[PDB]
Design a protein around this ligand. Structure first.
Ligand SMILES: [Mg+2]
Ligand SMILES: [Mg+2]
Ligand code: NA
Ligand code: NA
Length: 321
DNA sequence: CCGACGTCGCATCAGC
DNA sequence: GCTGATGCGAT
DNA sequence: GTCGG
C-alpha cells in the first residue's frame, strides 16, 4: 500500500536521531510512519496523508515529492554522504548511540572492521554489541523462546522455590517470534523499602549452567545481558535477555507494562486517565479532586488493575492495542 | 508564537 | 575519592 | 516535525 512512504519516513527518522541528534524529530517521523502503516488505502497525495494525526505540512510535501519522482532529493543526498551514513550505520551496534557513533566517525572509525581494529577505544557494552552484531539483529522464533523459558523457570525455582518469574514482552502475547527475552522476578521477601543478592543469585545460577554468556549491565534490580541455548548440530544465535527484580506490591504493574504492546499500554493508560486513574510501570494511583495523584492502590494480579479502571480483563494475546 | 515531545537503571565521564 | 551529569537502551 | 495551549 504505502511501504515506500513508511520506509522513507523511517529512514528519515534514523538520521534525525542518529545524525542530527534531534530525538523529537525522530519520534515525529516514526509517529507518521505508524499512522500511515495502519492506513488501509494506497495514498495518492500528501494532502490525503495530511489528514492523519502526526502528518503535517513538511511530511505532506515529502509524500508529494516521493509520489512524483519515486525518491526524495534530501534522502538520496544524505544516503550518499560518507560521514552521515557511517554515523547512522555504526549506531546499529548496541551500546553505540549517536554520540559515540559521531566520535568514532570523526576519527576515521567508520565500519565494523574499523571497530574490530580498535577494541581499546570501546567500552564493555560496545565490544559485546560488536561481538554479536549479527546475532542481535536476528529474531527469536517462539519455539526457541519456549526452550529459553524452560531453562529460566527451572533455574530460578531451583535457586529458591519461592521466586515468582514471568517472561513478558511479545512472547507473553503469544507472538510467533521475539526480539529479546524480558524476565520479571519477584520474591515474598522483597517489597518497597525492604536482599541485594536476590537478583545476583539468579544471574549466577544461569551463568553456572552456561545459559547466560555475557553481561552488559547488572545492579540490584536490573540485569541486561546475553544468553544462548545449548547446542553435533548448528549452534543457536546469542540472544538479548533482561532480568528485572521488582518488589512484590509493584510486580503486577510491572508485568502488565512489560507485556505491552507499546500501543496497548498507550490506549490502556489513556482510557485509565479518563476514569480518573494514572498507571505507570510501578503503581496505579487515583487522581484527586484537582489532579493530585494519591496513594498507590493495592494490586495482587493483573486483573486488579483492569478492575479499578472498569475495563474488561484482556488476555495477553489480545493486547496489540 | 513557542514549549512539550517518557522516564529511569546502570556505566562511565567531568568536575571538584 | 565523591557527586552529579551524560549516554545508552528501552513497554 | 507536529500538535496545541
Ligand atoms: Mg524452598
Ligand atoms: Mg527488552
Ligand atoms: Na495531520
Ligand atoms: Na546502538
Amino acid at each position: 500500500l504505502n511501504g515506500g512512504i513508511t520506509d522513507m519516513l523511517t529512514e528519515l527518522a534514523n538520521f534525525e536521531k542518529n545524525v542530527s541528534q534531534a530525538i523529537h524529530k525522530y519520534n515525529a517521523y516514526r509517529k507518521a510512519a505508524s499512522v500511515i502503516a495502519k492506513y488501509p488505502h494506497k495514498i495518492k497525495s500528501g494532502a490525503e496523508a495530511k489528514k492523519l494525526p502526526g502528518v503535517g505540512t513538511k511530511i505532506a510535501e515529502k509524500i508529494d515529492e516521493f509520489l512524483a519522482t519515486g525518491k526524495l532529493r534530501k534522502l538520496e543526498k544524505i544516503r550518499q554522504d560518507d560521514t552521515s551514513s557511517s554515523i547512522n550505520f555504526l549506531t546499529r551496534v548496541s551500546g553505540i548511540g549517536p554520540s559515540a557513533a559521531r566520535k568514532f566517525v570523526d576519527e576515521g572509525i567508520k565500519t565494523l572492521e574499523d571497530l574490530r581494529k580498535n577494541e581499546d577505544k570501546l567500552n564493555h557494552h560496545q565490544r559485546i554489541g560488536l561481538k554479536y552484531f549479527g546475532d542481535f539483529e536476528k529474531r527469536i522464533p517462539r519455539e526457541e523462546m519456549l526452550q529459553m523459558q524452560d531453562i529460566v523457570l527451572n533455574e530460578v525455582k531451583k535457586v529458591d522455590s519461592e521466586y515468582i518469574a514471568t517472561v513478558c514482552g511479545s512472547f507473553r502475547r503469544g507472538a510467533e517470534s521475539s526480539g529479546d527475552m524480558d524476565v520479571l522476578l519477584t520474591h515474598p521477601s522483597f517489597t518497597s523499602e525492604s536482599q541485594p543478592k536476590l537478583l545476583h543469585q539468579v544471574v549466577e545460577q544461569l551463568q553456572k549452567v552456561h545459559f547466560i554468556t555475557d553481561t552488559l549491565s547488572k545492579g540490584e534490580t536490573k540485569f541486561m545481558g546475553v544468553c544462548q541455548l545449548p547446542s553435533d548440530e548448528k549452534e543457536y544465535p546469542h540472544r538479548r535477555i533482561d532480568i528485572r527484580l521488582i518488589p512484590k506490591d509493584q510486580y503486577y504493574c510491572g508485568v502488565l507494562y512489560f507485556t505491552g504492546s507499546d500501543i496497548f499500554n498507550k490506549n490502556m493508560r489513556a482510557h485509565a486517565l479518563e476514569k480518573g486513574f494514572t498507571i505507570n510501570e510501578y503503581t496505579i494511583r487515583p487522581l484527586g479532586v484537582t489532579g493530585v495523584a494519591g496513594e498507590p492502590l493495592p494490586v495482587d494480579s493483573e486483573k486488579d488493575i483492569f478492575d479499578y479502571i472498569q475495563w474488561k480483563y484482556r488476555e495477553p494475546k489480545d493486547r496489540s492495542e
